[PDB]
């Protein structure tokens, strides 16, 4: 190899992580909020510089390598839970929150951030503003939201949509107060999910691109796909939605340039 070449999409706007973490209001756990992030540069250093009381645990990728990865989309799910239920926000976990409110898939490949919010979400006289679902007919599928309240008939006698014995209201309140322990105090939780598809990789990250060099052996990097070889002006047929081509040996052999929308063959040098 002779040269190192980096090719990333030309996007300038930065991602709005300050609007997710520093939002005045957070949602409940049975009606958790979801935001879509795309077409922006994602610098994750602002999430490391936070004080060492932000619990940060990420699955399927290391936190250090996040700045050299492109993504199709990012999803941010925000809510507030109790102190000791942060254990349940993890793949392959069960409990009252996980079964009935928020479920994570086993192949999650995403990060979870939690922090104590007792100074904001608690009130001296009682803060019943945050709810959670306690009764459900069956466990819910990953990333499914149930914003609906109807009576739960545990027994056998039906009831006229009114509570009573063996007819329960599904939702309950948290009732946070400042005079509790550490496990009974509100916690603000943000879950980041990285959606990676066969797409033009909108959410790139901080990286400057270089000029394209052909007919020479170089180190190349297209949207995080990095390797060593020679780049030839291909004459293959890609559909407008297709981004790269795979060979019989289950490894990429052709790729589209993210700045000028042309096709290139990759060959060993």
């Amino acid at each position: 190899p002779t040269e190192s070449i980096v090719r990333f999409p030309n996007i300038t706007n930065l991602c709005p992580f300050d609007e997710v973490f520093n939002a005045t209001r957070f949602a409940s756990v049975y009606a958790w909020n979801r935001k879509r992030i795309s077409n922006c540069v994602a610098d994750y250093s602002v999430l490391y510089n936070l004080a060492p009381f932000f619990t940060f645990k990420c699955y399927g990728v290391s936190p250090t390598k996040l700045n050299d990865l492109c993504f199709t989309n990012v999803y941010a799910d925000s809510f507030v839970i109790r102190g000791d239920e942060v254990r349940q926000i993890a793949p392959g976990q069960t409990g009252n929150i996980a079964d009935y409110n928020y479920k994570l898939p086993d192949d999650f490949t995403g990060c979870v951030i939690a922090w104590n919010s007792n100074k904001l979400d608690s009130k001296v006289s009682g803060n019943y503003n945050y709810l959670y679902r306690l009764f459900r007919k069956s466990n819910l599928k990953p990333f499914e939201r149930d914003i609906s309240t109807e009576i739960y008939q545990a027994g056998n006698k039906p009831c006229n949509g009114v509570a009573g014995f063996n007819c329960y209201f599904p939702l309950r309140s948290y009732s946070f107060r400042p005079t509790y322990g550490v496990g009974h105090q509100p916690y603000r939780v943000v879950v980041l999910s990285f959606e990676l598809l066969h797409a033009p990789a909108t959410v790139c990250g901080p990286k400057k691109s270089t000029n394209l060099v052909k007919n020479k052996c170089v180190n190349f990097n297209f949207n995080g796909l990095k390797g060593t070889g020679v780049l030839t002006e291909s004459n293959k047929k890609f559909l407008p939605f297709q981004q790269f081509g795979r060979d019989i040996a289950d490894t990429t052999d052709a790729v589209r340039d993210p700045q000028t929308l042309e096709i290139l063959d990759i060959t060993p040098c």
Partner: antibody, heavy 127, light 108 residues
Framework: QVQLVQSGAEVKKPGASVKVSCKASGYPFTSYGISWVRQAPGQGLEWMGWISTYNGNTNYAQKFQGRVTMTTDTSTTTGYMELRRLRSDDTAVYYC????????????????????WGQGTLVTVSS | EIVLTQSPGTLSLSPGERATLSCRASQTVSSTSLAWYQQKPGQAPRLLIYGASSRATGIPDRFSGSGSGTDFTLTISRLEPEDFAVYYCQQHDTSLTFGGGTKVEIKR
């Protein structure tokens, strides 16, 4: 350092219209909104409105609901404000501020305030 | 909408005492949605406190904020010659409105 520069003073007449400009420098333009406030000589502050620099969404005060309109230009990173049908009560000083009270992308409330102010533009309305 | 009242209208102190300013809210205002500003004669305002407790960037430690619910307080532990100005409280819990203002001068 974050910087905001406003235009010069105006000697507008009643029944006219006025444009006030505010050029930003030293930060990513589209990550923050822009707020407009004013102070009449001898009185206190008075919020006029907010505009998002990402999608152009605005939010005005009901006192200026039908009279004011704000715009942005991302190329030069400059905000503009029209006020129409100037009365004798519109003689004041107008301040452009960088906003941290409402999000630029999603439009929700944040924890902060007007954390960077301009020099102020004096508008005098008299026949 | 929410109306904020600043009390009192004028504080007459000496360069070195302790000052306490009070902002009173009509309705209930969340503590995450209140801020304080200082304005010197002939200058533009500037942010001092946000979130009713947090301190803005580059603000000397002698400024502190506190309060909740319907009553908020800004305290200056020791008064310097440069701390004589006008102070404003702002809420953005329901719309956005400002306070009346409170001037702090020298008592001699």
């Amino acid at each position: 350092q974050v910087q905001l520069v406003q235009s010069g003073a105006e000697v507008k007449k009643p029944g006219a219209s006025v444009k006030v400009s505010c050029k930003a420098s030293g930060y990513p333009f589209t990550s923050y909104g822009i707020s407009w406030v004013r102070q009449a000589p001898g009185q206190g502050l008075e919020w006029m409105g907010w505009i998002s620099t990402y999608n152009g969404n605005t939010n005005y005060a009901q006192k200026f609901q039908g009279r004011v309109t704000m715009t942005t230009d991302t190329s030069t990173t400059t905000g503009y404000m029209e006020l129409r049908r100037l009365r004798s009560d519109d003689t004041a000083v107008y301040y452009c501020a960088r906003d941290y009270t409402r999000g630029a992308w999603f439009g929700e409330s944040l924890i902060g305030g007007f954390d960077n102010w301009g020099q102020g533009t004096l508008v005098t309305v008299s026949s | 909408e929410i109306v904020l009242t600043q009390s009192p209208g004028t504080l007459s102190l000496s360069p070195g005492e302790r000052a306490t300013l009070s902002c009173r809210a009509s309705q209930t205002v969340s503590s995450t949605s209140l801020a304080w500003y200082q304005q010197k004669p002939g200058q533009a305002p500037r942010l001092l406190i946000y979130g009713a407790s947090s301190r803005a960037t580059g603000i000397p430690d002698r400024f502190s904020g506190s309060g909740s619910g319907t009553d908020f307080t800004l305290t200056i532990s020791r008064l310097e010659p440069e701390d004589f100005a006008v102070y404003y409280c702002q809420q953005h819990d329901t719309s956005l409105t400002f306070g009346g203002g409170t001037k702090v001068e020298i008592k001699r």
